[PDB]
């Protein structure tokens, strides 16, 4: 929970302190190994003690020293609230002055929900170390500030640390977030571990530190769109019904490949060596069927293809086994191929060789590392050679940004990559993540927004360009099936892709519905940082740009600054979202739609910039796919006037 | 140049193109040949990148032309596009063909940074630091001026390390421009990638004020050194008056050359030794040096007299600073009270430091003839210099490191720098000054009239005198230092290019001066709007483990949260334009620095924006530095929290080390 129990959120650091504590009902983060020197370890304790009354220092010093020895990190477990279930509550349940701050508090608690976060009690949402706060004192103080702040104040968050409330104005963001911002030369993984333990920084991933993670439905949608575009670009079909997709991995992100294929109406085959990962997804419903022998698999796949059934079929075994079996098959069975093994970690648990069993590999990778790498590289060569033979017979393969072709290249090996071949063109058009959360926590509101988003995209597609109408159709297919796929976890949220006008129109319609009373609560707009403008990442988000600027971070910095004075309720700039610490600069936003004309104006203005910034950059950096879309925007939007690149053809 | 000739600023890329640059204007100095060592592919891409700015119809000729520029200069400046129909300089704001006076002001600031009188390598778009650039090429300049001429107050120009991405819709309170320079994906921010991407036209190094269009000349260094001497005087001598006090230092080079004037403004006796007659006699001719001595014996007799008569005088010694130090050891009299060193010991073997054993000409010779022997003599001279300093220190002389890596390089030479036994001004002094909120307050009179600058000097003077009353003991001292400066600033004739001025002021100081300026613009006492700005050497704008955040020992000095937070916070609080740079001060990849400019036009909007933005731009870093463990920041933070409505920050509780 009620509004009574949530009054504690305004307390901050309780006086006197709560009793000391480990709750093993949830998964816990692995022990951190910062390897702090005696000097840094003393500083780490001192830094942590900054949050507490001096009268508590002596006992907390031993307590925090204990946490470092046992967990490798000072989480301050005794400050984690236990009098209520950590989750998103109705926005009207929060004892806050500002509805905007209340919305943020709701978003934060969702990131710390046991059902949502990876390591909830360690304040880790996803990605192993994609954190929300460095410790539970920062949580308590931030929540206190958010309950206390007005709309003429702005909360400054230094990698989890609430620096304090500073004067601003209603149109200003209520919070500015920076996670892991480093002086460029000191952004090593070693300095992360060190400074994370010393309480001077944290890794916020993308939506972990920016308070807008909503579960794995983003990956399901993402893979769905990827499959659809792959079908059009590589096969030439606007419909994947009857088409077979062979892929691998049922892990964190790759586990979504099953539902994605089904939603596309395709027969999707996912190979997984790990029975744990495979039967998990099977039990979850993300995997419809399971096959053990490859011969029975192909018979099943043949019958599925001919009957045009939307089905996900897991194969308990190595993906190389399936690939090499198809080579011995004189008949065409699989039309599309990919791979989502973790070849970014090829020799230590990410890739399992065909020569060994799952258990034998798990043993050899640490027992005989040299032998394991040799078998992996050999297995990689056998996989590519099989794909080559099948590609020559009509099959179309693409790399799913998992460094499969890169590692295969580094052993001996022509195929496109999802980031550089299909997503880059989608970003260039302006289509990217459009995420929203109904702050009423009512499923009815989510149902309505689903229908509103559907109705909006339908009318937009009728007058959209031929390129856009294909992207819009992809997201229409998704939003109509999204609800029945039961992907909602924690907060009532949804995700799709939309270009500039798509996001603007849906937002305005959402905002009208909040004002009309159809929506019983305001709606927070947000997105992943896997977007057109938000992230500079030479290995991913900007890997398709070949002017050389993929190593620069001008765009990401420009974008977050541009969002901040255009009406975002809060913004964030992170280090190494996606590809990893030091390898990316990623930023995002959240904007609360409360039905006011202000919110509509903010949304229209901000979303315009958040899309056309990257669209213009990507065009300037060599992407020609959205060049016409850019020029239409320029003609359509008053006040928009950009430098139009005249790209010389490399041959000429 | 009249308002008619400046209409060419609205053109952007001329159609048809102006004639190709046949020769080269030798009336100005030119940047050294760049060496990116581009691969065949990167070189091809560099040319393709440059061609993006031009009609495809001109690509045939420009390709070879830009290729030629690569082979000759190591960079594609696009010399063809450099305007030659007018003198590049700041012109009165009314001369510019802009819809927006805010944009017109930015154009004025831009052209000042490119003034032959101001810029180091003007035709290479470099203002200072050797490669601290304004734009990557002249196309970026032309388009930027085009956008600024045409833009309204409802648009914002996004500048990507020189590249004007375009005008995007915003609102009157939004920045008219957002500037980034050298922003990199962290693991790729190497000096090699800078050289590579600079040539490829993907990035540039903007230093601090070079890329942010707000460099105003060498009066920043003069003021900076004035403040340093004053604080060194108070902290190391315990005196508020340096009259009769003697400062010994070295170097009359680029920045070190301001030590002469700084000492005089402090009313002290400053002795600056310099082996290079080029630097020394230049300073003499510039009036930055009042006197010149040749032998050390006649020097010390002169210094004695000046000290006894409390004469404010700068005295240059043509010779080695070591020669003076060792002579002081033999002199029984107390002559010098304060000692420092500003030789370039960050490059002690490449001409930054000249040993005592050799003459200036002898040193230049074996600098390339016998590097091994030279390095031995340098390290030997370094040990002797410290040995002499140690003896004078034992006799009451107070020495400090000027952040030139003197003590660091001496330590590597095996000099007795331990019991460092001498404090570094950056970590010992400036950190506390920043923590109080005091830092660069800079303004430009857009009328380009000296009369306006005189008035702003008087307004600033009167303002600081009034703030003396209700200020803390610590802040009263800093205000006094800037009062001594501002009353003498005009007569020192430090203005080059635009009518500009710089001083240090804390939160309320910057706010009140801004408000008084804005009142004067509205009343008509000032003939034109005033652009507020600052160097990035400030309290909140820069994360730099070697400098601006070097006195923070909580471990966070490696982080860049504060700098990123600051520029964002300024951006939605009414800044006219903001900048976030990579590598300001210390160098590429070694710092993250941000800045702002804010135009005062007399309106309620400007007054409101100034009050709010300046509050954040100061108190952000004050609060951080307090949190990171600075005691001065802690005290200033608490006073602000009590004074400012809407200000509520996290107060750090410091544990006793005995508990650890
Ligand atoms: N949207 C996306 O899905 C996306 C986006 C960007 C990058 N990626 C990349 O995709 C990869 C997968 O991501 P994840 O989170 O699912 O990783 P993960 O480690 O959780 O899952 C990989 C799975 O593949 C299985 N596997 C390994 N070798 C196999 C083999 N030979 N045959 C069958 N199964 C095998 C592993 O057992 C594991 O379950 C990563 O490399 C990631 O960088 C994915
Ligand atoms: N505000 C400041 O002044 C400031 C700020 C930051 C850093 N620094 C540091 O200060 C140093 C000086 O900067 P600069 O721009 O003046 O450089 P500079 O190279 O132009 O000046 C150094 C001068 O010292 C002279 N010199 C060298 N060895 C000498 C010796 N033994 N005796 C006498 N003279 C000698 C050189 O001939 C030269 O003229 C640099 O190391 C710089 O990093 C200064």
mmCIF file of N, CA and C in Angstrom, chain B residues 476-526:
data_model
loop_
_atom_site.group_PDB
_atom_site.id
_atom_site.type_symbol
_atom_site.label_atom_id
_atom_site.label_comp_id
_atom_site.label_asym_id
_atom_site.label_seq_id
_atom_site.Cartn_x
_atom_site.Cartn_y
_atom_site.Cartn_z
ATOM 1 N N UNK B 476 37.145 35.827 0.913
ATOM 2 C CA UNK B 476 37.557 37.228 0.932
ATOM 3 C C UNK B 476 38.969 37.386 0.379
ATOM 4 N N UNK B 477 39.816 36.400 0.658
ATOM 5 C CA UNK B 477 41.193 36.409 0.179
ATOM 6 C C UNK B 477 41.266 36.256 -1.339
ATOM 7 N N UNK B 478 40.486 35.323 -1.879
ATOM 8 C CA UNK B 478 40.474 35.070 -3.316
ATOM 9 C C UNK B 478 39.923 36.269 -4.081
ATOM 10 N N UNK B 479 38.879 36.884 -3.532
ATOM 11 C CA UNK B 479 38.290 38.081 -4.120
ATOM 12 C C UNK B 479 39.310 39.219 -4.137
ATOM 13 N N UNK B 480 40.110 39.306 -3.079
ATOM 14 C CA UNK B 480 41.144 40.331 -2.978
ATOM 15 C C UNK B 480 42.197 40.165 -4.067
ATOM 16 N N UNK B 481 42.510 38.916 -4.396
ATOM 17 C CA UNK B 481 43.489 38.621 -5.438
ATOM 18 C C UNK B 481 42.997 39.094 -6.800
ATOM 19 N N UNK B 482 41.712 38.892 -7.061
ATOM 20 C CA UNK B 482 41.127 39.286 -8.336
ATOM 21 C C UNK B 482 40.834 40.782 -8.398
ATOM 22 N N UNK B 483 40.708 41.411 -7.232
ATOM 23 C CA UNK B 483 40.554 42.860 -7.168
ATOM 24 C C UNK B 483 41.864 43.542 -7.535
ATOM 25 N N UNK B 484 42.961 43.024 -6.992
ATOM 26 C CA UNK B 484 44.291 43.519 -7.317
ATOM 27 C C UNK B 484 44.558 43.371 -8.811
ATOM 28 N N UNK B 485 44.069 42.271 -9.376
ATOM 29 C CA UNK B 485 44.237 41.982 -10.794
ATOM 30 C C UNK B 485 43.403 42.906 -11.678
ATOM 31 N N UNK B 486 42.104 42.975 -11.403
ATOM 32 C CA UNK B 486 41.172 43.686 -12.275
ATOM 33 C C UNK B 486 41.432 45.195 -12.302
ATOM 34 N N UNK B 487 41.998 45.731 -11.225
ATOM 35 C CA UNK B 487 42.319 47.152 -11.168
ATOM 36 C C UNK B 487 43.570 47.465 -11.988
ATOM 37 N N UNK B 488 44.368 46.437 -12.260
ATOM 38 C CA UNK B 488 45.604 46.603 -13.019
ATOM 39 C C UNK B 488 45.521 45.975 -14.405
ATOM 40 N N UNK B 489 44.443 45.241 -14.661
ATOM 41 C CA UNK B 489 44.287 44.501 -15.913
ATOM 42 C C UNK B 489 44.369 45.407 -17.137
ATOM 43 N N UNK B 490 43.658 46.529 -17.088
ATOM 44 C CA UNK B 490 43.597 47.449 -18.208
ATOM 45 C C UNK B 490 44.929 48.076 -18.578
ATOM 46 N N UNK B 491 45.668 48.540 -17.575
ATOM 47 C CA UNK B 491 46.924 49.245 -17.814
ATOM 48 C C UNK B 491 48.051 48.308 -18.244
ATOM 49 N N UNK B 492 47.832 47.004 -18.109
ATOM 50 C CA UNK B 492 48.824 46.030 -18.554
ATOM 51 C C UNK B 492 48.696 45.728 -20.045
ATOM 52 N N UNK B 493 47.629 46.245 -20.652
ATOM 53 C CA UNK B 493 47.400 46.136 -22.093
ATOM 54 C C UNK B 493 47.533 44.702 -22.596
ATOM 55 N N UNK B 494 46.685 43.818 -22.079
ATOM 56 C CA UNK B 494 46.780 42.397 -22.383
ATOM 57 C C UNK B 494 45.773 41.968 -23.443
ATOM 58 N N UNK B 495 44.924 42.899 -23.855
ATOM 59 C CA UNK B 495 43.893 42.611 -24.843
ATOM 60 C C UNK B 495 44.472 42.393 -26.234
ATOM 61 N N UNK B 496 44.184 41.232 -26.808
ATOM 62 C CA UNK B 496 44.473 40.978 -28.212
ATOM 63 C C UNK B 496 43.207 40.451 -28.883
ATOM 64 N N UNK B 497 42.860 41.035 -30.023
ATOM 65 C CA UNK B 497 41.630 40.682 -30.704
ATOM 66 C C UNK B 497 40.423 41.301 -30.029
ATOM 67 N N UNK B 498 39.437 40.466 -29.709
ATOM 68 C CA UNK B 498 38.191 40.931 -29.111
ATOM 69 C C UNK B 498 38.413 41.599 -27.759
ATOM 70 N N UNK B 499 37.583 42.592 -27.454
ATOM 71 C CA UNK B 499 37.627 43.255 -26.158
ATOM 72 C C UNK B 499 37.143 42.298 -25.075
ATOM 73 N N UNK B 500 38.081 41.589 -24.455
ATOM 74 C CA UNK B 500 37.733 40.559 -23.485
ATOM 75 C C UNK B 500 38.518 40.691 -22.185
ATOM 76 N N UNK B 501 38.014 40.043 -21.141
ATOM 77 C CA UNK B 501 38.635 40.087 -19.824
ATOM 78 C C UNK B 501 38.399 38.773 -19.085
ATOM 79 N N UNK B 502 39.323 38.417 -18.200
ATOM 80 C CA UNK B 502 39.179 37.211 -17.398
ATOM 81 C C UNK B 502 39.553 37.479 -15.940
ATOM 82 N N UNK B 503 38.869 36.790 -15.030
ATOM 83 C CA UNK B 503 39.209 36.806 -13.611
ATOM 84 C C UNK B 503 38.637 35.565 -12.939
ATOM 85 N N UNK B 504 38.929 35.394 -11.654
ATOM 86 C CA UNK B 504 38.343 34.304 -10.886
ATOM 87 C C UNK B 504 37.209 34.814 -10.006
ATOM 88 N N UNK B 505 36.125 34.047 -9.951
ATOM 89 C CA UNK B 505 34.992 34.370 -9.092
ATOM 90 C C UNK B 505 34.243 33.096 -8.728
ATOM 91 N N UNK B 506 33.657 33.067 -7.534
ATOM 92 C CA UNK B 506 32.904 31.898 -7.098
ATOM 93 C C UNK B 506 31.462 31.982 -7.589
ATOM 94 N N UNK B 507 30.578 31.191 -6.987
ATOM 95 C CA UNK B 507 29.197 31.096 -7.452
ATOM 96 C C UNK B 507 28.474 32.442 -7.444
ATOM 97 N N UNK B 508 28.364 33.052 -6.268
ATOM 98 C CA UNK B 508 27.658 34.322 -6.131
ATOM 99 C C UNK B 508 28.379 35.441 -6.878
ATOM 100 N N UNK B 509 29.701 35.330 -6.966
ATOM 101 C CA UNK B 509 30.506 36.302 -7.680
ATOM 102 C C UNK B 509 30.184 36.345 -9.161
ATOM 103 N N UNK B 510 30.201 35.182 -9.804
ATOM 104 C CA UNK B 510 29.875 35.087 -11.223
ATOM 105 C C UNK B 510 28.443 35.537 -11.484
ATOM 106 N N UNK B 511 27.526 35.101 -10.624
ATOM 107 C CA UNK B 511 26.112 35.446 -10.752
ATOM 108 C C UNK B 511 25.880 36.953 -10.703
ATOM 109 N N UNK B 512 26.470 37.607 -9.708
ATOM 110 C CA UNK B 512 26.237 39.028 -9.477
ATOM 111 C C UNK B 512 26.865 39.902 -10.559
ATOM 112 N N UNK B 513 28.074 39.549 -10.984
ATOM 113 C CA UNK B 513 28.734 40.269 -12.069
ATOM 114 C C UNK B 513 27.928 40.127 -13.357
ATOM 115 N N UNK B 514 27.420 38.921 -13.596
ATOM 116 C CA UNK B 514 26.589 38.646 -14.763
ATOM 117 C C UNK B 514 25.340 39.519 -14.766
ATOM 118 N N UNK B 515 24.669 39.577 -13.621
ATOM 119 C CA UNK B 515 23.460 40.377 -13.475
ATOM 120 C C UNK B 515 23.745 41.862 -13.682
ATOM 121 N N UNK B 516 24.847 42.338 -13.112
ATOM 122 C CA UNK B 516 25.238 43.735 -13.267
ATOM 123 C C UNK B 516 25.620 44.060 -14.709
ATOM 124 N N UNK B 517 26.292 43.121 -15.369
ATOM 125 C CA UNK B 517 26.595 43.255 -16.790
ATOM 126 C C UNK B 517 25.309 43.392 -17.598
ATOM 127 N N UNK B 518 24.385 42.466 -17.363
ATOM 128 C CA UNK B 518 23.120 42.419 -18.086
ATOM 129 C C UNK B 518 22.291 43.683 -17.873
ATOM 130 N N UNK B 519 22.337 44.222 -16.658
ATOM 131 C CA UNK B 519 21.668 45.485 -16.358
ATOM 132 C C UNK B 519 22.255 46.617 -17.193
ATOM 133 N N UNK B 520 23.573 46.594 -17.358
ATOM 134 C CA UNK B 520 24.273 47.639 -18.094
ATOM 135 C C UNK B 520 23.985 47.561 -19.590
ATOM 136 N N UNK B 521 23.764 46.350 -20.091
ATOM 137 C CA UNK B 521 23.424 46.169 -21.498
ATOM 138 C C UNK B 521 22.029 46.719 -21.779
ATOM 139 N N UNK B 522 21.097 46.439 -20.874
ATOM 140 C CA UNK B 522 19.723 46.905 -21.022
ATOM 141 C C UNK B 522 19.629 48.424 -20.904
ATOM 142 N N UNK B 523 20.335 48.989 -19.929
ATOM 143 C CA UNK B 523 20.306 50.430 -19.694
ATOM 144 C C UNK B 523 20.934 51.214 -20.841
ATOM 145 N N UNK B 524 21.904 50.606 -21.513
ATOM 146 C CA UNK B 524 22.574 51.257 -22.624
ATOM 147 C C UNK B 524 23.939 51.801 -22.247
ATOM 148 N N UNK B 525 24.363 51.530 -21.016
ATOM 149 C CA UNK B 525 25.697 51.914 -20.570
ATOM 150 C C UNK B 525 26.744 51.130 -21.354
ATOM 151 N N UNK B 526 26.481 49.841 -21.548
ATOM 152 C CA UNK B 526 27.271 49.026 -22.461
ATOM 153 C C UNK B 526 26.641 49.097 -23.847
#
